[PDB]
Structures are given as structure tokens and as C-alpha cells.
Amino acid sequence: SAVKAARYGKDNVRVYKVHKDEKTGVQTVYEMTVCVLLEGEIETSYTKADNSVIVATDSIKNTIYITAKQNPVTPPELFGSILGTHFIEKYNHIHAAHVNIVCHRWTRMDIDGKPHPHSFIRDSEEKRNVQVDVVEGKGIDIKSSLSGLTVLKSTNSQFWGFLRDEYTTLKETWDRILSTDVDATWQWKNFSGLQEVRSHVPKFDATWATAREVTLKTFAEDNSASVQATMYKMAEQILARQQLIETVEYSLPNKHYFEIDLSWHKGLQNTGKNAEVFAPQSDPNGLIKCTVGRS
Amino acid sequence: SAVKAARYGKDNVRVYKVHKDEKTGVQTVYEMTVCVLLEGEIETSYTKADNSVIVATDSIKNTIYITAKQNPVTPPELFGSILGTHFIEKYNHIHAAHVNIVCHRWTRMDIDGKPHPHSFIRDSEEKRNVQVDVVEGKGIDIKSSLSGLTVLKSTNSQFWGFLRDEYTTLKETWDRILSTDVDATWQWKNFSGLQEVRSHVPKFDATWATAREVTLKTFAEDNSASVQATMYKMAEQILARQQLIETVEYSLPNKHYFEIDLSWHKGLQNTGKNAEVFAPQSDPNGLIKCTVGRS
Amino acid sequence: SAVKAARYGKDNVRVYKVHKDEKTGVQTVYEMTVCVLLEGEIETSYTKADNSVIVATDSIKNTIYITAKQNPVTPPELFGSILGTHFIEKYNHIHAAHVNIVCHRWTRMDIDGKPHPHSFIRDSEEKRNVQVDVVEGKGIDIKSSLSGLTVLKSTNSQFWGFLRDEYTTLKETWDRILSTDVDATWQWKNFSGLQEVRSHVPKFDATWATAREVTLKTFAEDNSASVQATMYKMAEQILARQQLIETVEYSLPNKHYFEIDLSWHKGLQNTGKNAEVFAPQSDPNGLIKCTVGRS
Amino acid sequence: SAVKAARYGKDNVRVYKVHKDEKTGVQTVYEMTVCVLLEGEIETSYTKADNSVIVATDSIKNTIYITAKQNPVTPPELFGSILGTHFIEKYNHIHAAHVNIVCHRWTRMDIDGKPHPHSFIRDSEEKRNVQVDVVEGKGIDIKSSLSGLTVLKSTNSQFWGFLRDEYTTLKETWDRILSTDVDATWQWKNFSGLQEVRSHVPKFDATWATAREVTLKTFAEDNSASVQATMYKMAEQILARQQLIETVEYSLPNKHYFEIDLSWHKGLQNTGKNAEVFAPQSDPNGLIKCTVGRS
Ligand SMILES: CN1C(=O)N[C@@]2(OO)C(=O)NC(=O)N=C12
Ligand SMILES: CN1C(=O)N[C@@]2(OO)C(=O)NC(=O)N=C12
Ligand SMILES: CN1C(=O)N[C@@]2(OO)C(=O)NC(=O)N=C12
Ligand SMILES: CN1C(=O)N[C@@]2(OO)C(=O)NC(=O)N=C12
């Protein structure tokens, strides 16, 4: 037997941080869930009971809190890069750090039209994420994502002209509901290290905002031929708007809303042109995935 | 043995309905989860295998869809009252109908400042609920609620002067974080029947909006002495603003955010006046409940 | 405005306790989730910012751990009664304590036929619960329950002879699948206080075991006319086997498994006598409730 | 822009199947959740609104049910291989099929010592899974797994001799609780196709049983130096017992149970040798991963 791969660390580290602007009195809050997994010359902790090579996960946790105290937690791409870099630089025998951050929404409350200085609402379960892979000698690989953005349109979605064989029962449609939970990931050009990441800091929030805006506008405006066609349009637009992105991945469930034939009851018409009441289906669900690159 | 209480029905009925304004082309969507449980002269289905008295739960489900097709689904207080009334009127032997409705948010999308005619976002997991108890000869009892409204304030919360004995370790504080998930219920005056409910229809959306506005404003603005003191202020204001409400119930978790002493690491100061990084606690949680009435 | 009802306390207190038999070396583990809510002369904490009457929920939490250290945590009926009694006796102004306990399964591992002295498995998500209401001057009300016992039978379930009207589409059946998640509660005779509870300690584990055995045997053996008929038989048997139980409540979802007509594909026969492949339905679900007493 | 990767299909397809032994009258039930995602010459569905190349996910769903009707659903490695092979053989332009199966437990009920012919219990939330990747011209890659096996031992776990620096607060221990949720995956030698899979059918159930037995025995019996050391022993034993496995992956959370110092209350001793009452921690959690191969 031989250890082919190993990684270990602390998952589900909840972190809150506040910034107090002293001039205005305005407070701003950040809340995240952090995972750090390490790789390196750790095989003997598995094979020979050698704990000497183990940076305890408890210590990893402490390190997350200390790093958040000493550094900005925004944008998450930066925080993750600082955190990951710390582990590979501090510990001679650690050669990679894998940092996952889930950012939770705390949106400033509006009270009688005024933004409140220190009151916030969890306005959506939509997340902003980063995956930061810091690898000794190969730089910093960042994947940024938004997830849990749930949307629905009541018309201007179609699905016809698909393959029909002896397995096919689905009727072609020129007018359906489309509902989905958007998971979109954009992968940055490899960064050489922390300096290069810092040099692009403004681009992170700007590109997240662009990706979200493009997603919503394209979903709302595309008279959709299919999930496939619509998601491709989103990706192509994001790529066109940020040079430093290599790939965009979308993963979209097709959350079906079924017509209910009520014609058995007093000839009630609730199908086709007359469809008003639908049965949202919990399961099963279509799952449509695309990775778009440049050429 | 004797059956002391019995109720039965269909739970977790997902319902979507669309309205198409033909003039403007504007579509509006409603999505809910419905539960209907019936009571009446049904004991023999339990005691003597007598299925003859059972309105099948499958039929209850059909009835929910048919009622949604034939009637407005908004406000939910009205829909629930219509639905409940149907069962007690249609079936001689059914004497009560218990209708629970969970309303899911589908907020119209804004695209370049314009509200989109047929595109929506699940903008929050916050729900609007009704419990409608239709009881033959005793009228219609409606409890309206909002739930899953998660809020946080970073200062202007205190907790001091509480009882201290040999079980007490908690330090008094004059500045803490307060975070909660608001569950608020307002119980209407008994309605004699469907006519009286209909006569008050506008009051339902208006009172829900008031309850939500009061909750958010009071939470944001109250320099809180405790959860108890703050929630009481919310309730008293709602009662003052709608004559037809008898009681308001609040149920508020105290979602603790703990200071992290980092003084063990290079004398880092992260407590009291210097507290920036906190550990949100998953469990356990305070749970504070209040029912406020008139006198 | 006037406070009509108030209660407050600590929820989601996770507790583990170990017993070490010194003779055998055998260890036994208990794990629970505890909620304690208090009532009493606490109105002024809500109405006048008077924290002086508040036993802090943090102190309630400490008290739960101290009580578990000083007393047996089994049977949960006893532990809950001790815990609740403490609050009403210690604090002059607290007049009721509501104690909910969820017991998690940690079943001893069998290794080559031998029970292992200190290794356990979470063998089921089935829970054993208690609700203990300790009310100053009115004694101790205990409701014991099992929940999350998920069962399925593949035949010997029927449902025919139900009411058929213009809302009915369900076909009568003489052979279906029946699947359910059993929630059963037995309510004890009021106890005068802690002495009387202690006097009946053996009855608690014995009655839980009886209730579970009766549930499983009756479910498995009853050629079921309906959920209603089967659940009544369970309840009547439990009542017959323990004098000190006043009522038994069952709450049973009907988790539907639908036939799939495949006759459209090469005349495949998968309905009625030929039904092999079924679609388990996530939602909606029947919900059947019964409370059985004595007469 | 150019599509670099694409896959699409149906997720969360719930499937139940019954076998009726006519001789004995014994029924046996299988329940699973199935995901099938396809790859192939499908780019134009994304880039040119060309639905002609799309095998509708609705058709994929139908195909899952038809395949379950026509073929054994056990072992899941076989079912997945049949299902995946169907898509690449039926459709000229589909070149890979990715089949994920989650098997749910339905354990036969024991009634007075007799196994019941048609009554089952969900005895654990532990799953048995397969991932079957059928790739045109490269054969069939099967990963088998067990997951959600939650275990706890109350002693004979240690953690000392780990790295100590200025980030370290964790005290070395020679006696702790160890609790984990076991996720173990074994990757089979590549199979050339369906014939070779069929030739090894007995090995699938046998190897799953071995992996589970080894996991439980090693966990229970190892006086653990660390999660790392213990999980390695499990993997090495599984590899030694089945020639046709290439790699074994374990992913183990370290579910912390914290000592509670009660010495502040009347000098109660509840730490070290006297630790009886512990606080199970929801989060954060260690996460320890290992892939073991041969050499
Ligand atoms: C109705 N429907 C399918 O049956 N397949 C799809 O995924 O769900 C698909 O491939 N494209 C769709 O947009 N709509 C679908
Ligand atoms: C810190 N804390 C308590 O210990 N009790 C309380 O509920 O959580 C309470 O009764 N009131 C509070 O607002 N804050 C609390
Ligand atoms: C098929 N079915 C119903 O439609 N109603 C029931 O609850 O689900 C009911 O009242 N009794 C049943 O056992 N079966 C049912
Ligand atoms: C106490 N503890 C750590 O702090 N790191 C570990 O993962 O949780 C680790 O690396 N090994 C352990 O078994 N125990 C741990």
C-alpha cells in the first residue's frame, strides 16, 4: 500500500467580521464559512502514526480567525489568497492550501429611505463563493462563483424539435415556465502569487456584479430555445466583459412545473392557452451543465 | 378505547398560479404550499374499517387545485377561508377544516430600472403564512404570520442587570451583536363566515406589510435592553395600528455571536472595544416568546 | 397592551454523557438535545426593561450540564422531571418549566458476535423524545414519544370503499404499498411530583419498548383497510398494556408510491398484477392523525 | 467562445422495485435515487439552438424506469453499467454516460424472531452508492461507496505529538472521544464492457460487505493515534482483500466533543479523568482525506 493523495484541514469555520467607520459611525458586517485543506509531506501521519508533521486542524481554525483579524476579508478572492499563502510559506513541508469560502448575505436595512448605519437583513440565501488553490511553485488558481440564485419566468421559454424515438413521451411546447437555481463559476488566469492577486483586487467585486447582472438580464430577456441555448449566451457575454477569465461553468437544474388537466371536473379548461394552475415538481429535475472557454 | 380527537388530510400540496393582464401583457405569479386537515363524523374509519366516511386525501388535493383555478389565491386569508368553507359546506359530516398556507416569494425582476413583465426572483426564504380554522357553527379563525425574516444588528444591543447566582457565568454587556429569525403571528377577530372575511380583504395585505415594517424599524432603531423588551415594542405597535387584531405572538431565537480572545497570540486585542472577529454559534440558542393582547 | 403569555429559555442544547462500569470496563453513552422554556412572574422583562427577573438562558444552559453531571440522564422522563423541578423550586418567581428532550441513538457495536465495550453506531435517525411540563401546584405532565421510525410494506395494504363524488379520481385498490414515518406519543397520568415519577422509573423504558414493538408488529401483520384502521389498532393495544397511560396520539404520513404505466413502450405491462417499478412521490403526502383514550 | 465541456441529463430520479418469489411468497424491495448525465456531439444545442441532438431529460427518465423493469437493479454496479451502456449504444452521437445511484436501506423486519415476508424498516440513513462512467472506446469505470455511516467510540482514541507553534492552543490528549461519518470509496479496475462487469457480479456485494466490516472492526479495535493512522489501516485491509480494487478513498469528519469545565460551580470535577458530561460541537469540524493505492 502507498498514499496516492492526502489532504486534511478544518471545514465549516463560521467567521463574522465588523468594520467601524469612525467618521460616519457606519458599520459594515461580513459573514462567511471557511474550509482550509492542506497537502504536503504528511504521508507519515497516515502510515507511521507520525503526528509531528500535522499542523492541527484546531491550529488551522485559530489561523483563520487571526488572519481575518489582521487582514481585509473582502474581496473573498484576496482573503483566500492571503490565507492559503500563509500555510505554504509558514510551513516548509506544506506544499498546497485549498481554501473554500462561502459568503453569506447581510444587506444593509433601508429605514424610511435611509440606509441604516448598523442594521442588516439576510435578504437572500444566494451565496458568493471562492475556491482558492495555492500550490507551491505553480501560483494561485481562483474560481469565483455565485450559487443559490433562484429565478422563474412564466413565459418566453420553449422546448421543441428535440429527438423523438420509442423512449419519448414529452410533447413539444412553444410556451412553458422556466425555473432554475443558478450556479455559475468563472475561473481566473493563474496568478503568480499574492502581489499579482492584489494588483487586480477591484476586478473581483466588479466581475461578480457583471456575472450576476448578465445572468439575470439574459434569463429575463432571452426567448429561450432551451436551457442549453440560454446558459451559453450568459457565458459568452461574461467572457466578452473580462479578459482575465479563462472559463465560465454554469450548472442549471430544470425545475419542472407541470400542467394539471382538470377537464374531468365539469370540463374545466386548465391546459395549453388556458393553463393557470400548475403543479411544481420537487423531483426529478433536469440538470444542464456547460463550460465555455475562448478560441 | 374511544377516539378523543381525529383529523386527516393532504399536506405539502405545492401550487403555482399565474395571472395574465391582457391589456399590459404583465404576468404575476403566486406559489404556495397547502395543507388541509378535516375533522368530523369520521371515527368509524378508525374503529370499524368504514372508508365510506373518508373524503380521500387524493380528492382533497384535487379540490385544492380546482379551488385555486376558480378563485383568487390572494390574499391567502381569503383563499384559505374559501377552501375551508368548501369542505364544511360540501360534506354534511365534515365539521371543521384546518387550512395552512405557506406563501413563497416570487419578486418581479428589475432589468435596467424597468420591472420585467414575466421574470421573477426568489429574493428571500422569508415566508408569509396563514392558518385558517373553519369550524361549523363557530365561524372562521385566521392567524396570519411572517417567518424566516433573518436580521442582524452590530451594536445598540445590551444585556445587563439580569439575575446572578451560583449558576451564572455570563458577563453583563453594554454592546453586543443581536441576530434573530423573526416569527410573528397576528390573530384576527373571529369572522362569522365568508362574507365577513371578504368585507375585510384589503386589510390582510395592509396588515402584513405593517407588521413587517414595524418589525424591521423597531429592530433597527431600538437601543435594545433585551430581546424581551424589543419584541414587546413591536407587538404593541402592531396592535395599535389594526383594531381587528386580538393578539400578536413573537418567537425569536437569540443567535449568539461570541467574542474570540486572541491575546494568547502576540497580545492581539479582539475583545470588548477591540472586538472585530466573532464566532457565530450554531447552537445552542436562546428562544424568547411573547403573546401580547389588549386590556 | 398586556402580556397574555410568555415563555423563554435555551433551545438546541446538545448533551453527551458517558457511564464507565469499573468492574467490566464497559462504557455506555447517552446523547440528547435539550430545550428548557420557563414561565412565571417575568412580564416586566418585556414591559419595563426589567432584566432582574430573567434567569439568563446562558445560566439555563449551565444548569442543564450541571444537572446531567449530578443525576442519571436515563430514563429521559426522569431527567426531564429533575431538570424541570429544579427551576420551579430554585426560583420563587418561576412557576412552570417546559423541558423537551430528543434522545439520539448510539447503539453498541457487535464485533465478531461480541458487544464492544466502548464503540457505538448511529444505527437509525429514529428518536425517542419526552415533553415534561412541570407546573407549580399542578404536578408533572409527561408525554413520551418515538418519531422518525420509517417503515414500508409491499402488499397487504388496501384502500377501497371511500367516498366517490365529482372531486374523486382515485381508483379503489385491493393491493398497494404502504410507507410511513411513525410519530407516536403516549401521555402519562399526571404525577404529583418527583417522588411519584421516581416510583415508576422502570415503566418508562418498558412502555417505550412496548409501544415500538406493538407499532412494528401491528404494521407488519395488519392486512390494512386504511392508515386510520391500522393506527387505531396500534393505539388500542398500547393502552391495554399500560394502565398509567391516559392517551396515545399517532401522526402518520401516507408516503405514496405511484404505479408507472409503461404500455406506451412495446406494450410493457407494469400496472396492477404486473406492477414491479414504482415512482415514490416526495410530495404531496396524506397525513392521518388519531388520539385514542379510555371509556 | 467555444464549449470546452458539456453534460446534461436527469437528476433525482426516485426508483422503487419489488421482487416477488412465487414459491415462498417472500417479497424483496429496492429503492434508489438515480442521476444520468450524457456527453457527446451536443455542442450545437448550446451554440445554435439545435434541439435535434438532445435526448430529452424526460426521455432519460423514462429510460431509467424501462431499464429497471427489464433488468435486475442489484448489484447497483451492474444496473448502472447496463443503464450507461444503453445510452452510448442506442445513440450514435452520445459518447459517455455518467450514472450515479444512491441505494436507500429497506431492511426486512424481524417479528418474534421470524423475518417478515413483505415488511421493511429504514434501519439507517447510511447509503450504498455507485458512480458508473461508461465512455465509448475506454470501457466502464466503477466507483463503489458507502456513506453516512456514523460511529462513535468513547475511549481508545489519542492525539498527541502534533506540531506546536505560536498558532497552537490545542492540549495533547491520551484519551478522547472519536466520532465520524464514514465516506469510503473503492475504485475498480477498468472493465472493457458489460460482459466483464457481469463476469464479476458476485464481487460487488461481497466487497461492499468487506469494506463495511473492515471499517467497523478497525474503528472499534484500533487504539487510535489519529484519524489519519486509523483510516489508513482500514484502506490497507480492504486493498489486501480484493485484487480487482485499484484505490480506496476515505473522507472522515472529526466531530469534536468538548470537555466542560464545571469547577466554577461548587468545585465540580468534570475534566480529564473525571470528564462525564461533554458538549458535542456542531461546527467547525476536522476533515481528514486519504487515497490509498498499491505499489
Ligand atoms: C423539458 N426538458 C427535457 O426533457 N430536457 C431538458 O432538460 O430538462 C433539456 O434538455 N432542455 C430543456 O430546456 N428542457 C428540457
Ligand atoms: C444573553 N442572553 C441570555 O443568556 N438570555 C437571553 O436569551 O438568549 C435573554 O433572556 N435576553 C437576551 O436578550 N439575551 C439573552
Ligand atoms: C390513498 N389515500 C387517500 O387518498 N386518502 C388516504 O390518505 O392518504 C386515507 O384517508 N387513507 C388511506 O389509507 N389511504 C389514503
Ligand atoms: C484534534 N484534531 C486536530 O486539531 N486535528 C485533527 O483533525 O481534527 C487531526 O489532524 N487528527 C486528529 O485525529 N485529531 C485532530
Author numbering:
A (entry chain AAA), B (entry chain AAA), C (entry chain AAA), D (entry chain AAA): 1 to 295
Per the authors:
Serial crystallography at conventional synchrotron light sources (SSX) offers the possibility to routinely collect data at room temperature using micrometre-sized crystals of biological macromolecules. We show here the versatility of this setup and methodology by performing structural studies at room temperature (RT) of three additional enzyme systems of biological relevance: (i) Klebsiella pneumoniae CTX-M-14 β-lactamase, a β-lactamase relevant to multi-antibiotic resistance mechanisms; (ii) Nectria haematococca xylanase GH11, a highly active xylanase suitable for industrial applications; and (iii) Aspergillus flavus urate oxidase (UOX) in the presence of the long-lived intermediate-like 5-per­oxy-9-methyl-isourate (5PMUA).
